[PDB]
């Protein structure tokens, strides 16, 4: 399954502007779940809208989410200057979430106009490891009740996009792993130290990259809340 948005968009503040994210299938459909989420500069990921059509509490009104015409659209009334960013939606695909590539919204004109964090995720910004090695990534979850919520692990670098990684949920116990990283990866988490665990083994070049973890859970705002992404660099 291959999901398609538009590369850019361009738009100028007061505008409305709609991004569009559609499916290799030929239609988002309601289990799709689609989330929708925001990147702006040094990789700062926030979640827009989860379970296609929810705005996450906290969110400004100008952002709405629905499925319309076999696509996810996200729309926003009265685009503002802070609103240049990256804009990715995410599919459930039954047993994994696949990413779009990313709308580019440049917002050009006049700035000024426009309406105006409990949840924290804190990750280390950096780790370097050899190759043949294992690497531990941490998260530590605060300002909510940490095991009630699952966190997912996310992966990116220019040119391959964002990739899911898995999933932990320290309630159940369950973990569900991409096909790419079930071998590479393993997840765990420490109730205690309300900290989740991403383990990296056999390491090799292509492991340099940015490794995210964010918030989950089961019929709500999926990838509403981020961590910073540590930045692992694999040495020579
Ligand atoms: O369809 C609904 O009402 C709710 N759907 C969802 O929340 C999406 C979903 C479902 C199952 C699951 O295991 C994962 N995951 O991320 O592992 C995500």
Redesign the pocket.
């Known amino acids: 399954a291959v999901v398609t948005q538009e590369s850019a968009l361009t738009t100028s503040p007061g505008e409305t502007v709609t991004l569009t994210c559609r499916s290799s299938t030929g239609a988002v459909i309601?289990?799709n779940?689609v989330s929708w989420v925001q990147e702006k500069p040094d990789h700062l990921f926030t979640g827009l809208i989860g379970?296609n059509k929810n705005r996450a509490p906290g969110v400004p009104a100008r952002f709405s989410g629905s499925l319309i015409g076999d696509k996810a659209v996200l729309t926003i009334t009265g685009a503002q200057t802070e609103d240049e960013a990256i804009y990715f939606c995410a599919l459930?695909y039954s047993?994994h979430?696949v990413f779009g590539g990313g709308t580019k919204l440049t917002v050009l004109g006049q700035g000024g106009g426009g309406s105006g964090s409990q949840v924290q995720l804190q990750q280390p910004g950096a780790e370097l490891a050899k190759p043949g090695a294992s690497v531990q990534l941490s998260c530590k979850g605060s300002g909510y009740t940490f095991p009630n919520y699952?966190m997912?692990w996310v992966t990116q670098r220019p040119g391959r996009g964002l990739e899911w990684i898995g999933?932990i949920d320290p309630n159940s116990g369950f973990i569900?792993y991409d096909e790419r990283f079930k071998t590479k990866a393993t997840l765990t988490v420490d109730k205690p130290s309300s900290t989740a665990y991403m383990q990296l083994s056999s390491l090799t070049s292509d492991d340099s990259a940015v490794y995210f973890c964010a918030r989950?859970?089961?019929?709500?705002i999926?990838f509403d809340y981020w961590g910073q992404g540590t930045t692992l660099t694999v040495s020579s």
């Not at 989950?216 to 709500?220: A, F, H, Q, T």
């Open positions: 309601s289990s779940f379970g459930w047993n979430w699952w997912h999933r569900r989950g859970c089961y019929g709500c999926h």
